[PDB]
Design a protein around this nucleic acid. Structure first.
Lengths: 121, 98, 117
DNA sequence: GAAGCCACATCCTCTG
DNA sequence: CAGAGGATGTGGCTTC
């Protein structure tokens, strides 16, 4: 089973999820042993490719992301200058400074896919 | 830094370079950072005398020195029988920040 | 080899021991199991998660799913967790869409593996 | 003071 | 055989 039966419940009951429901402190974890300049380019070119590695500093939780099903509503570099805007533990769920390679982010329960996925059973 | 309190190699080794009376066993080789190795196994012996490590030889002390490469303390003069040199332009990034 | 639970009950992985040395040949290599049928060829990477140094350095961190069992030639933990502190290492499966199982209290990464003090 | 560091120790290996 | 190097125990020394 790709997902848990009570998909909505686990998100609204697990300390793990609710601890990441609020806007938390995140940062780019890619190529840590590389100069700030190289890390800046790698992270931007990759975002344009629709992928990256971002982790919630506070909690310690890392993630490899894929902004797809090039996109628009998944990777927008226009909503603000100098920055840019999956199934986690059987739960369908859904900005970084282009200079500091850090920022804020959070998780959001995916009602849509939760249904589509749950329907595949 | 903990080079102060507890004894090092590079901190120790250079008690013998600067001191005229220990040239029996080593010497500065030139204007630029370089150093010769006179008795390769009397060297190691005294580093045992200090470290309280009587088993010590060149092979042992030497390995320790070859670590320094990746950390940019010192480097090898290629092909020369027992001669390396100190990187100071890096000892001060290794003893202070930026 | 022996297995342990996950935070996604669709996947399981090795019993990575309590406390080990920074960058060692692991005492038991890393197996990662696919219960859900996965195309044998899909990639799996891990990322060491901890409130302190939130992305640690790892080696042979990427592996290939084969016979529904992704194995890591030899994973090695370089970036230390700290005193009393372990890794909640993340586990990615490269698919459309990819999926992850968090894994709290995985392993304590210090410079000495636990010598008789 | 065990729990993390540290900077060699001691080791056996290649490979020029 | 020297010389770079992985692996793994060792002992002194700061830090919780």
């Amino acid at each position: 089973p790709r997902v848990v039966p009570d998909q909505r419940s686990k998100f609204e009951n697990e300390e793990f999820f609710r601890k990441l429901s609020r806007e938390c402190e995140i940062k780019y974890t890619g190529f840590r042993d590389r100069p700030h300049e190289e890390r800046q380019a790698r992270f931007q070119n990759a975002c344009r490719d629709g992928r990256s590695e971002i982790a919630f500093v506070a909690t310690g939780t890392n993630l490899s992301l894929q902004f797809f099903p090039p996109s628009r509503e998944y990777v927008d570099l226009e909503r603000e200058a100098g920055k840019v805007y999956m199934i986690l533990n059987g739960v369908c769920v859904i900005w970084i400074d282009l200079q500091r390679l850090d920022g804020m982010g959070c998780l959001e329960f995916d009602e849509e896919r939760a249904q589509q996925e749950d329907a595949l059973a | 830094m903990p080079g102060s309190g507890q004894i090092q190699l590079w901190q120790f080794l250079l008690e013998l370079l600067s001191d005229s009376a220990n040239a029996s066993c080593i010497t500065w080789e030139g204007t630029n950072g370089e150093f010769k190795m006179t008795d390769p196994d009397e060297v190691a012996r005294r580093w045992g005398e200090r470290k309280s490590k009587p088993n010590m030889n060149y092979d042992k002390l030497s390995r320790a020195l070859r670590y320094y490469y990746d950390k940019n303390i010192m480097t090898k003069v290629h092909g020369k029988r027992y001669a390396y040199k100190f990187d100071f332009h890096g000892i001060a990034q290794a003893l202070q920040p930026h | 080899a022996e297995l342990v639970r996950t935070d996604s009950p669709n996947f399981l992985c090795s019993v990575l021991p309590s406390h080990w040395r920074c960058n060692k040949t692991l005492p038991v290599a890393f197996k990662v199991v696919a219960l859900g049928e996965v195309p044998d060829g899909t990639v799996v990477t891990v990322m060491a998660g901890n409130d302190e140094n939130y992305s640690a350095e790892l080696r042979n961190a990427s592996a290939v799913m084969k016979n529904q069992v992704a194995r890591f030639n030899d994973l090695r933990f370089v970036g230390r967790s700290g005193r009393g502190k372990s890794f909640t290492l993340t586990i990615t499966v490269f698919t459309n869409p990819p999926q992850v199982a968090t894994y709290h209290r995985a392993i304590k990464v210090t410079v000495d593996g636990p010598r008789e003090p």
